[PDB]
Amino acid sequence: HHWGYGKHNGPEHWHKDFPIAKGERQSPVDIDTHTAKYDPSLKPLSVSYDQATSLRILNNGHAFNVEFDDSQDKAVLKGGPLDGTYRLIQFHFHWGSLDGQGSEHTVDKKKYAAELHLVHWNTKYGDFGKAVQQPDGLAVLGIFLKVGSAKPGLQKVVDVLDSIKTKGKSADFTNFDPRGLLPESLDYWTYPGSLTTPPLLECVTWIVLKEPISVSSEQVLKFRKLNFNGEGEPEELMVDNWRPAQPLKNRQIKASFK
Ligand SMILES: NS(=O)(=O)c1cc(-c2nnn[nH]2)c(NCc2cccs2)cc1Cl
Ligand SMILES: [Zn+2]
Numbered sequence: 001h002h003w004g005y006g007k008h009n010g011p012e013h014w015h016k017d018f019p020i021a022k023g024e025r026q027s028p029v030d031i032d033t034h035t036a037k038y039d040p041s042l043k044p045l046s047v048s049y050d051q052a053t054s055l056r057i058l059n060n061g062h063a064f065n066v067e068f069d070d071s072q073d074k075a076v077l078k079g080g081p082l083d084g085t086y087r088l089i090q091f092h093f094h095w096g097s098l099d100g101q102g103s104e105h106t107v108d109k110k111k112y113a114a115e116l117h118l119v120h121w122n123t124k125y126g127d128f129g130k131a132v133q134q135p136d137g138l139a140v141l142g143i144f145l146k147v148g149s150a151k152p153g154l155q156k157v158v159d160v161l162d163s164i165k166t167k168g169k170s171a172d173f174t175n176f177d178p179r180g181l182l183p184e185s186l187d188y189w190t191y192p193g194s195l196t197t198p199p200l201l202e203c204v205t206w207i208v209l210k211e212p213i214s215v216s217s218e219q220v221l222k223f224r225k226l227n228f229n230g231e232g233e234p235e236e237l238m239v240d241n242w243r244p245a246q247p248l249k250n251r252q253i254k255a256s257f258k
Contacts, residue, residue, distance in 0.1 A: 153180020
């Protein structure tokens, strides 16, 4: 009876196994655009992905992860609110059953169709497992998806999903360039938060881009054909794998822009 996003094991249940679910810095949150303050002291954000080495794509039974070689400083996030160097380890998405829901963060209570999370760990802690035990251990770059024009840089991901339909399936996924998933502007909001999946550790600096990327209806429809189940089990479509907005509590959301 493990956590998930079903009727009986969804986000409202997670506190029973993970009491930090009701903690002081849980994610995601609603970004109230009128309450977020411009912080002119935020340094410019540095996304250095030209040397990124993608390795593999995995269906982990609640999303799919694109994993990178993070055994050296190739693909790194620096600047903005961050002290030091954060190495890209994986990206994944959250999405909906319908275009009107799917994102984890919301903007003035608006839900986007999906949300991309590029997960990075703080290299001063030496490995990801040590970093998630620290209040500044991770940095996640969050990017909203809206449905409209296709995102050409997403299609290589869409086209491999047929090969990882069910939980525990993986496929080689080399030479994927995550720069193709970025919007034009790097304007962002930032706040201290958590993992949005169990174990919900309070170890994340969130950096959420203001500009959404556009993907096509056909692209998001292919996300919704994945399965939560393993092979040879009753089909349960992988949709609505998002945690809703959590209380902001004693936190301020800072804007990089006026
Ligand atoms: N939604 S999120 O707050 O961005 C988050 C979600 C996951 C996730 N959910 N399920 N599987 N991974 C994650 N895993 C990191 C790694 C995966 C494998 C080796 S390290 C990290 C973060 Cl910060
Ligand atoms: Zn995520």
